[PDB]
Structure formats: C-alpha cells, structure tokens
Amino acid sequence: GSFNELNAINENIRDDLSALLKSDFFKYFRLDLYKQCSFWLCLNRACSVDVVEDWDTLPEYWQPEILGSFNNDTMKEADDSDDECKFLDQLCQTSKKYCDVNDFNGKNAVLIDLTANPERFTGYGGKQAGQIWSTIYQDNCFTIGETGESLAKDAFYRLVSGFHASIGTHLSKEYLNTKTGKWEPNLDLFMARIGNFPDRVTNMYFNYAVVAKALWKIQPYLPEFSFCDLVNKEIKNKMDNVISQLDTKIFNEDLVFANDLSLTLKDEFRSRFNVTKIMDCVQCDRCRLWGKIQTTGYATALKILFEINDADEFTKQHIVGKLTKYELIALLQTFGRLSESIESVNMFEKMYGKRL
Numbered sequence: 001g002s003f004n005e006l007n008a009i010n011e012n013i014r015d016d017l018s019a020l021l022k023s024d025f026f027k028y029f030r031l032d033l034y035k036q037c038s039f040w041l042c043l044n045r046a047c048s049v050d051v052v053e054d055w056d057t058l059p060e061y062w063q064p065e066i067l068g069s070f071n072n073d074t075m076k077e078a079d080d081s082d083d084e085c086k087f088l089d090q091l092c093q094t095s096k097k098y099c100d101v102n103d104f105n106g107k108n109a110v111l112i113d114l115t116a117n118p119e120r121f122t123g124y125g126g127k128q129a130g131q132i133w134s135t136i137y138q139d140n141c142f143t144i145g146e147t148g149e150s151l152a153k154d155a156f157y158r159l160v161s162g163f164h165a166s167i168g169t170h171l172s173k174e175y176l177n178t179k180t181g182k183w184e185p186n187l188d189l190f191m192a193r194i195g196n197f198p199d200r201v202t203n204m205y206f207n208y209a210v211v212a213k214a215l216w217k218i219q220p221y222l223p224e225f226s227f228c229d230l231v232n233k234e235i236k237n238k239m240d241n242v243i244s245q246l247d248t249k250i251f252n253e254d255l256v257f258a259n260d261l262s263l264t265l266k267d268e269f270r271s272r273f274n275v276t277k278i279m280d281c282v283q284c285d286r287c288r289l290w291g292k293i294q295t296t297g298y299a300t301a302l303k304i305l306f307e308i309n310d311a312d313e314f315t316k317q318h319i320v321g322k323l324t325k326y327e328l329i330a331l332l333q334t335f336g337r338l339s340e341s342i343e344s345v346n347m348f349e350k351m352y353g354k355r356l
C-alpha cells in the first residue's frame, strides 16, 4: 500500500543521498581488521561459497576470495584522529570553554573507503553464510511474560529479514556476468531470492521506514556538527535537505512498538542487535564490512527510536548530541543501502516486465 509513498520519497532523494554519501564525512568507515568470532562454523571455501556459479570453471581473479576482498589501496590508518569517535556534540565549538573516551576498542582499526568498496555480489554463501543468518534469526528470544513480548520478536525478525533481503537484492542488482566480465542486474536471481517472496520485499520497505523515521526524529536536535570542518562545511545542511524530504504519514505508526514495549524489553531488543558481533564471523571481507555497517545502522536506529520516544526536550537534545560520528555514518549508510534496494526493486519490476 504505502509502498508508493516511500518510492516517491525515495526517488525525490536518490541523487542528494548518493552525493551526501560520497562526501569525505560519510565515505569512510572505521573497521577493526582483527575479528573475534566468539560464537563458534564451516570455514572451508567448499562450504562458504554460493553454488550460483561453477567456480572451478572461472579464472582465478573471479573466485569468491577476490570478488569479496577489499581494494587494498583503499584504507588509511585510523585512530590517528579520533574524529569518528567523537560526539556530534564536540565536532564544532559551540562556545569558548576520544576513541578511548568513547569505547572504540579496536585492535587494528582502519578507515575503509566505502566508495571504492561497494556492497555487491561476492560469491559468498554456502553453509557458513547459512549458519550465520540462521543464528541471527534463532537469537530472536526475549524474556517471557514481559509486556510486548510477541511484538518485540516480530519487529526483531522483520528488521533482520529486511536487512537480509536488502543484501540479497543488492548482490542481484550488482551481479557479475561470468562471460562479459561485466557487472549487471540479474533478474532471475532477484526473483529467486526476493522477487517471489512478497514478505521479503515488504520487510525492506519496513526497514526503509524505520531508518527514515529515525533520521527524521533526530533532525530537530542535530548539533551544528560541520560548519567548522573546512572540507565538510555543507554536509549538515545537505543532510537536513534529505531528511526534510522524508516526511510521511507512515511515521505516525509505531513501527518498532516504542509505545508498547517494556522498558527492559527495549534494552533486550537493543542487546540482541550482538548481531553486530556475529558479523566478525563473516569470512567474506566486504560482506563483513557492509554487514557491520548495517547492523550498527539498525542498532543506532533502534536506540534513537526507543530513547527519543520517552521524550523530554533536554534529554532528546542530549541523546542526539551524544551520538557519535561513527553512529551517524552507519545510520546514513544503512539508509543508503535501503534507498538503493528500494530503487532496485522498481528496476527489477520494470525489467521483469520488458521480459514480455
């Protein structure tokens, strides 16, 4: 139903949002090169690759190991500057008067160029990918009795499903032609993973709205976090420009059941998203990267929607101001993946059409 509204909203914003995301302020993400998979899991390529291609047939430089690796030359040393670790509060000086101070405990953290490391088909899959998605869905268990118990599990599942579908949609749009050696849409794959499962398409639009509602809820309390940055002076404005075009009646609906969830159920829900931790179990480097960015994006969104819910102007202003640049980056980059996933659906529907 409301599908059309989000599509309208998304088309009016696709360009501005893509430009914003390529800015120096949003183009980099802090990622710990060392990973601690503490939840364990199949490790051999024999069970980590997708059957979609007959790999033994393709050239070496087209194997999942290369398709999913970073573009070496695309990651500067991090924590050499604590900019990403600072609060929006403290990016610019509001009046004449942090990676350690704010908890970024990364062994060997680095800044990866997301513009040079887009999410796309990598060939990752098999039992491993299956074991991971499986564990996330199976970790949808809250404290029984608690008010809004059911609702909490429905939202958790839906968010994960939309995240899952968004990736599937993505690897489908940006698929590799093992003959032309060109990246191009793969309608058949889209149809097999997302196309023929309405609920999965719905969940992406669910995630799209959840994240868009968060950006819209913080807009009024955003600190003037960029006027001082000589390079990124306009970023804050350019973000307001996007967020402002996001207003929709859909935001009236309590998407994450904030007004129906126990105050402890809300923390459990926040704790489940942990989902960000399993991401370190993802052996495909680019998948880990974007997985981590999106899970952090959702966890950020949940925090915003849950906390700002109880309101209190002083508090609201604090909640958004004490949000870290790292979180805002994750949040807006997650919105960027959703925006593109929604666009890709419309493309595939029109592609599925010309097929006749």
Ligand SMILES: Cc1cc2nc3c(=O)[nH]c(=O)nc-3n(C[C@H](O)[C@@H](O)[C@@H](O)COP(=O)(O)OP(=O)(O)OC[C@H]3O[C@@H](n4cnc5c(N)ncnc54)[C@H](O)[C@@H]3O)c2cc1C
Residues within 6 Å of the ligand: 050, 119, 120, 121, 122, 123, 124, 125, 126, 129, 130, 132, 133, 160, 161, 162, 164, 165, 167, 168, 171, 193, 200, 279, 282, 286, 287, 288, 290, 291
């Ligand atoms: C966090 C993470 C990030 C990843 N990132 C990338 C990436 O950038 N690029 C790339 O090539 N691959 C990526 N993958 C791999 C991808 O998600 C694969 O598992 C896939 O292409 C191989 O798909 P599959 O058919 O074996 O199953 P999937 O399609 O993962 O199958 C899992 C199962 O869950 C169900 N399922 C599928 N979609 C949904 C849904 N939306 N909601 C509820 N259930 C669903 C299916 O019925 C099936 O039983 C990632 C994996 C993980 C765990």
Ligand SMILES: *[C@H]1CC(=O)N(CC)C1=O
Residues within 6 Å of the ligand: 138, 139, 140, 141
């Ligand atoms: C979480 C709670 C529970 O009992 N299960 C089944 C093993 C879960 O997935």
